[PDB]
Amino acid sequence: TEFRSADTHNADDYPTVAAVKYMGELLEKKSGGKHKIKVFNKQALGSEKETIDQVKIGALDFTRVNVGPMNAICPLTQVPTMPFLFSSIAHMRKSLDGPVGDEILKSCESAGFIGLAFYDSGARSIYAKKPIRTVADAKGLKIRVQQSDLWVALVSAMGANATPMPYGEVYTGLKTGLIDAAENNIPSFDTAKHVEAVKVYSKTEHSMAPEILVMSKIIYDKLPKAEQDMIRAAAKESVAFERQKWDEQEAKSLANVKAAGAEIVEVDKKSFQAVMGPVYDKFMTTPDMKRLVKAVQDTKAE
Ligand SMILES: O=C(O)[C@H]1O[C@@H](O)[C@H](O)[C@@H](O)[C@H]1O
Ligand SMILES: [Cl-]
Ligand SMILES: [Cl-]
Ligand SMILES: [Cl-]
């Protein structure tokens, strides 16, 4: 069959878009040409929230979203969203590739989603019209976040005025001053054109919330076991491809925004980490969540 998958990003070569296209190529190979994936980027099939609901009801086969908008519907996705959980991108990758990530992926089935892969999304940092070097600088800042209660809390802990909005509304919001700031990785800051509106990128690195690729359980459950396995393998094998593309995009977008006049600022990251204890207290509240946070931070470096 020809499966459909959604992505919000406009660029046809954005790493997440390229990665699901690569997954499709692998699936064609593994299935002897039976199965294919068509990737609808440019939010053609809806916002992240909308596509999650379409996958839930089986109208859409796959969606590639960030964990943020999955925080309510698949609560263990909150774990890798948590601020300053991971010590480095290497730590994140090892954690997500191992038993922690695999358990989180499996946990979404209870809500109607087959979790297939985590893709890299770098670290998210504040961008605004002024430098945010300490948490005091963030006080009162009108900053967009994703549609997630955890995210509202995360940024509120900095003293900021968290403003949940869909991704597609952020560019115009920044241009018109409806919002002061937002937060994201550099490729998003670049490719969504947020850098056109605000130039100061303060490296708070306050989350490494990854992307998650999910399939509709309704659709998955009707496929033969052998074909379910092909899909899972193709997704898993696409992660290494996504990461190589992601590394390249990190560099390309950094060059783009520096050339465009962005001011990249180092910050007192401990200032921001020091306010996050209550976020763990208020969100990491179940045995599974506590166990998985601990497993992540018990992970040994290579
Ligand atoms: O902030 C957002 O809404 C966006 O952030 C990006 O990092 C992510 O790649 C998008 O899928 C979307 O979640
Ligand atoms: Cl395609
Ligand atoms: Cl969106
Ligand atoms: Cl944001």
Domain-wise residue ranges, the chain? 1-302
* 132: Cβ contacts below 8 Å, ≥ 6 apart: 126, 138, 141, 181, 200, 202, 204, 265, 267
* 3-state SS, residue 164: strand
CB-facing half-sphere around the CA of 174: CA atoms within 13 A: 25
Q: Is 147 assigned to a binding site?
A: no
Residue bearing tokens 């005025």: 161
Q: Is 227 assigned to a binding site?
A: no
C-alpha to C-alpha distance for 301 and 77, rounded to whole angstroms = 23
> Are 138 and 132 a contacting pair, CB within 8 Å?
yes
Distance from the alpha carbon of residue 217 to the mean position of ligand 2, in angstroms: 22
Closest CA to 69 of 48, 53, 96, 51: 48
Residue 41 in contact with ligand 1 by CB distance below 6 A: no
Cα-based angle 237, 252, 184 (whole degrees, multiple of 5): 80
Q: Is 124 assigned to a binding site?
A: yes
C-alpha to C-alpha distance for 244 and 240, rounded to whole angstroms = 6
- Domain 1-302's class? alpha beta
> Are 211 and 64 a contacting pair, CB within 8 Å?
yes
Residue 43 in contact with ligand 1 by CB distance below 6 A: no
- Surrounding ion ligand 3 within 5 Å at CB are 8, 47-48, 167
Solved using = X-ray
Q: Is 211 assigned to a binding site?
A: yes
C-alpha to C-alpha distance for 202 and 199, rounded to whole angstroms = 10
Distance from the alpha carbon of residue 144 to the mean position of ligand 1, in angstroms: 12
Nearest 10 degrees: Cα torsion 243, 114, 294, 209: 40
* 3-state SS, residue 192: coil
Residue 121 in contact with ligand 1 by CB distance below 6 A: yes
Q: Which of 5, 62, 167, 205 to mutate to test the pocket of ligand 1 (most atoms within 8 A of CB)?
A: 167
Closest ligand 1 atom number to CA of residue 8: 11
Please say whether the dihedral angle defined by the alpha carbons of residues 190, 193, 196 and 200, taken in this order, is positive or negative.
negative
Rg, Å, the chain Cα set:
19
Closest CA to 252 of 12, 14, 9: 14
> Are 292 and 159 a contacting pair, CB within 8 Å?
no
* The two structure tokens encoding residue 125: 């940092």
CB-facing half-sphere around the CA of 275: CA atoms within 13 A: 19
Distance from the alpha carbon of residue 89 to the mean position of ligand 2, in angstroms: 28
Distance from the alpha carbon of residue 55 to the mean position of ligand 3, in angstroms: 14
Q: Is 10 assigned to a binding site?
A: no
> Are 78 and 284 a contacting pair, CB within 8 Å?
yes
C-alpha to C-alpha distance for 38 and 14, rounded to whole angstroms = 15
Closest CA to 69 of 78, 79, 60: 78
Closest CA to 150 of 95, 74, 53: 74
CA distances to 1, 10, 118, 150, 169 from 80, in Å: 33, 25, 10, 11, 25
What resolution does the deposited structure have, in angstroms?
A: 1.1
CB-facing half-sphere around the CA of 179: CA atoms within 13 A: 26
C-alpha to C-alpha distance for 69 and 299, rounded to whole angstroms = 26
> Are 145 and 170 a contacting pair, CB within 8 Å?
no
Amino acid letter for position 137: D
* 137: Cβ contacts below 8 Å, ≥ 6 apart: 130, 131, 202
Alpha helices in the chain (DSSP H): 15-30, 48-56, 78-81, 89-97, 99-107, 135-138, 149-156, 170-176, 186-191, 217-221, 225-259, 269-273, 277-283, 287-297
> Are 168 and 47 a contacting pair, CB within 8 Å?
yes
Q: Which of 8, 169, 201 to mutate to test the pocket of ligand 1 (most atoms within 8 A of CB)?
A: 8
Which residues make beta-bridge pairs with 6?
40, 63
CB-facing half-sphere around the CA of 282: CA atoms within 13 A: 14
> Are 81 and 71 a contacting pair, CB within 8 Å?
yes
Residues after which the chain is discontinuous, using a C–N cutoff of 2.5 Å: none
Q: Which ligand is nearest to the CA of 28?
A: 2
Q: Is 184 assigned to a binding site?
A: yes
